[PDB]
Amino acid sequence: PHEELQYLRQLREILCRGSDRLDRTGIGTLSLFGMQARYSLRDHFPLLTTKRVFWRGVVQELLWFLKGSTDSRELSRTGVKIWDKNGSREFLAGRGLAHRREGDLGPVYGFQWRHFGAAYVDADADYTGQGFDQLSYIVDLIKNNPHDRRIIMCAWNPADLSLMALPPCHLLCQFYVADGELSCQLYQRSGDMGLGVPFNIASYSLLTYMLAHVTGLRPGEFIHTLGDAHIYKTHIEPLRLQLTRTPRPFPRLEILRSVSSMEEFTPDDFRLVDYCPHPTIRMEM
Template sequence: MKSSEQAYLELCTKILETGTKKEDRTGTGTYSIFGHQMRFNLQEGFPLLTTKKVPFRLVASELLWFIKGDTNIRYLLENNNNIWNEWAFEKWVVSEDYTGPDMTNFGLRSQQDAGFNQQYQEQMEIFKEKILNDDEFATKYGDLGAVYGKQWRDWKTSSGQSIDQLKQVIEAIQKNPDSRRHIVSAWNPEDVPNMALPPCHTLFQFYVEEGRLSCQLYQRSGDVFLGVPFNIASYALLTSLIAHECGLEPGEFILTLGDAHIYTNHVEQVKKQLARKLRPLPQLSINKNKKSIFDFELMDFDLQGYDPHPSIKAPIAV
């Protein structure tokens, strides 16, 4: 088995060398391959990249947001997490309530026009302030629809009932560890049209072997430079938390990607990262006094020995 980070870096190299140039919904363009799998041994260390700094606090607060079943970005903003802002912001700037400068195609324009970028940043700050301080505004424009947390914790059935998939899968792991049905799905075809962003990480499955809990995620679409490092760390953390609750050790995290792509405006950043040397993986420490994953807060996680290379900034494609 390759070291955790080496597997990721080899994926980056493969896409740069063999990826097909494709257009995409954002208008940015990508280099893409279809079908790729990486395996991460969680016994070797926590798989947070060392060739660039990945903010663990943002990974953890987003995962807690999912676990809570929340779909409103207010919780994220309260924890200084801005990774979902653009999708909520877009809903506001296309509405009749918005009266500021034209924000059409703000994702690309903010990268290409310094004057527009200043306007965009000003409007984003107004938006964030309203989300944090105006309950009615937050309800209307902060909610992203039936995204991950909703599907994990409150999947609606055709009869109007609710399924807490996450709670059920934990109970199933505890009662019947050898089952082949330890599955949580975020891909609900009925709800996809009402989501700000249809789930990229669509389905995950747990597997118990010799006292260890492993997880495999199928991800339909992976932004390899910005998104995939977060996804790896997030599901490694989720696996570790569920293993803790179930009295198991973390095993492997396996990531299976559908469309794995590098955006055309991330190529130079990827090359810079590939030129860096690997450093030792950090170790994850979890508050042992808490048992249920539904009780954890940010203060209950500690990442020890994380000494990465500096972060590498890149624009997000919306």
């Protein structure tokens, strides 16, 4: 069966037996707790096809994370605007972080990944050598101790929550090496099935391809584990539309160049081959 059907089945399960609860946004959601799906990376790339996924966003955001940035202006410069609402001086003021310059998200993914446990100053500070560099950590383990059971990168630092524009949803990833293949499991505490989850599958699938490339391994599987998997009430009509669509065969992902380091990737290094999605489905928020 087409692997996209897991996601579509999860949509149906939530619609059909999800709990109706008033959430933070006050829009209301239907939700289930605890889900898991499995996506092969060996012969294709799991970029969902029953709607067009914002691939350009997926690529730029991950490279932005990987270099340790916490500056939304830095992502915005590449034309990807998805963090700009959260980086505005207005939004930050609303969070009780009015002292921040425009763009300073606080110690979000980039900072946690490259400097876990360091004291955050601002987005312009030099954090060289400060905190625990989890990216170096996992690459070293994958290369030199591939069967280790602690190949983890974690973004959840509760001591840093009050400094963050938003608390992370992707709590950690774990990697696993067997038979020359690299696999990845993501624990995501909160998944907006409508706008978030297809994008998120793509992000960590991409990360796995990049790590596999850099470490001389082939991509294996991506395992997506969800906590609160939910559908916003405002998404019920477009998602019912999406549920009428049959998945197309997944595309392939090609890396166009030998890249020696996780930090040396650029968007021009990737080629998506035969991505043929159904049309974009607009959904509110």
